[PDB]
Amino acid sequence: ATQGVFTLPANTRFGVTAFANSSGTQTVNVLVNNETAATFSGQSTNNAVIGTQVLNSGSSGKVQVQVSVNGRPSDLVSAQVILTNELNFALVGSEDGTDNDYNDAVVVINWPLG
Amino acid sequence: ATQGVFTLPANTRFGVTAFANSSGTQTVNVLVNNETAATFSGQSTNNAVIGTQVLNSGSSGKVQVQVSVNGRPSDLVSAQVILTNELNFALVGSEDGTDNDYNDAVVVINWPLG
Amino acid sequence: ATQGVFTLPANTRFGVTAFANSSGTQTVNVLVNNETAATFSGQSTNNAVIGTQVLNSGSSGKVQVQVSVNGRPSDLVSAQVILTNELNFALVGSEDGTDNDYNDAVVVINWPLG
Amino acid sequence: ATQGVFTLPANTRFGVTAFANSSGTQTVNVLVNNETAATFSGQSTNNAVIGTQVLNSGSSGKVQVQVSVNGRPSDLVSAQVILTNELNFALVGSEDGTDNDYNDAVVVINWPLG
Numbered sequence A, B, C, D: 001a002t003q004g005v006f007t008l009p010a011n012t013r014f015g016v017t018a019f020a021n022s023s024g025t026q027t028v029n030v031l032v033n034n035e036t037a038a039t040f041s042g043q044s045t046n047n048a049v050i051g052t053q054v055l056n057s058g059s060s061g062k063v064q065v066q067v068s069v070n071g072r073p074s075d076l077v078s079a080q081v082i083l084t085n086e087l088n089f090a091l092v093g094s095e096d097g098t099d100n101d102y103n104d105a106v107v108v109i110n111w112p113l114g
């Protein structure tokens, strides 16, 4: 099934934050309405926050996360969780190798902000 | 129901990261086995990261997040989500006022690392 | 924070299913637009499906679950999870005593159907 | 990523319940320790419960859900959610066709019981 694609409230600010846990340098791309809106990169095996940014979901609300290492797309896993019918987290894990820890780049999207 | 309390696997490193979305200064305390292990403080209405750290869950695996604003405890909401039976997120929102956006401090705990 | 309240897309069929795990007889009421639309009762310590039903969210999309034991309201916990940006689960646990297993009545709402 | 595989606490009773939402007959196999422990089947486009059972996670705690329709395994999506650090849901959706509603068989695993 498609992973890393989320429908957010239209025209709404959201936070996107990426963490690295791999020997490989991670590159995380965030697409809003199918166009790159943010790119983060780094290399850590200790959960470095390689990027954090506030974006707007735009007219369509479509947000997609992609992750690659050495130009090869990582396999993604994702889900969205809503607390007290209001607080939202869109979650992404990714795997760049063979151990299946899926933490090589971890991405958290949160809204609402403010 | 109690919120903000999570049982992690014993002796496991985890990341904890806090974001702020409120006019009030947020104080986030992270307890491991009932003792303070990290404290973050900051003010933002733009989802700023007010702290990030890597901790060890210790022998008990018990991790608790508490949030207060100028000494007043915030009401919390939380849940844990596991993707592909491997990647864990323990999520906390908090409310310091009357609007019930529950994002006034947002805390994300993730494991495994590495 | 408020628990057991979910906003579904309007005029949408959804499933609601209740399970019992307690010495006490559980009464589960499912409200749509603040009016009871389904009720289930029963006792089990072995997860009996005390009821399942297909309901329509109606014009408001507001769905609330309430649980009581011989008229005494149980404490609720809840969250919503979305898989592959399309499959929704609204989840409720409830506690009628002191042990905090929160499984005394468990309610699962799922959509879309068909 | 692997989906529909969950590690439960060892020797723990859990509920498993399946719903159908498709033109095709769903066969759901529930494996414990890599051996079939339960099989449910049925056809519904109205979320009928096609099976429910209490099982034991056994010494390894490994539980897997597989879904087949028209002689072929369906594509699965899954996640585990934990409420108030106590109540566990392991959730599975499945797609037997081309519409990507992922509800064709929906499987809910819950623990603890009792």
Ligand SMILES: C[C@@H]1O[C@@H](O)[C@@H](O)[C@H](O)[C@@H]1O
Pocket: A021, A022, A023, A024, A045, A095, A096, A097, A098, A099, A100, A101, A102, A104, B114
């Ligand atoms: C240090 C290692 O680097 C990679 O090979 C990752 O895929 C592993 O998960 C681990 O983080």
Ligand SMILES: C[C@@H]1O[C@@H](O)[C@@H](O)[C@H](O)[C@@H]1O
Pocket: A114, B021, B022, B023, B024, B045, B095, B096, B097, B098, B099, B100, B101, B102, B104
């Ligand atoms: C700017 C405002 O500050 C507080 O009153 C918060 O409780 C509100 O949610 C909002 O963030």
Ligand SMILES: C[C@@H]1O[C@@H](O)[C@@H](O)[C@H](O)[C@@H]1O
Pocket: C021, C022, C023, C024, C045, C095, C096, C097, C098, C099, C100, C101, C102, C104, D114
């Ligand atoms: C048999 C017991 O019945 C009640 O006291 C429940 O609150 C307990 O969780 C347990 O199920």
Ligand SMILES: C[C@@H]1O[C@@H](O)[C@@H](O)[C@H](O)[C@@H]1O
Pocket: C114, D021, D022, D023, D024, D045, D095, D096, D097, D098, D099, D100, D101, D102, D104
């Ligand atoms: C009635 C239809 O039956 C199948 O084709 C399913 O894959 C569809 O999702 C729909 O439920």
Ligand SMILES: [Ca+2]
Pocket: A022, A095, A096, A097, A098, A099, A100, A101, A102, A103, A104
């Ligand atoms: Ca890896």
Ligand SMILES: [Ca+2]
Pocket: A021, A022, A101, A102, A103, A104, B113, B114
């Ligand atoms: Ca890794």
Ligand SMILES: [Ca+2]
Pocket: B022, B095, B096, B097, B098, B099, B100, B101, B102, B103, B104
């Ligand atoms: Ca607030």
Ligand SMILES: [Ca+2]
Pocket: A113, A114, B021, B022, B101, B102, B103, B104
């Ligand atoms: Ca706020």
Ligand SMILES: [Ca+2]
Pocket: C095, C096, C097, C098, C099, C100, C101, C102, C103, C104
């Ligand atoms: Ca109880």
Ligand SMILES: [Ca+2]
Pocket: C021, C022, C101, C102, C103, C104, D113, D114
């Ligand atoms: Ca119980």
Ligand SMILES: [Ca+2]
Pocket: D022, D095, D096, D097, D098, D099, D100, D101, D102, D103, D104
């Ligand atoms: Ca389908």
Ligand SMILES: [Ca+2]
Pocket: C113, C114, D021, D022, D101, D102, D103, D104
């Ligand atoms: Ca279907």
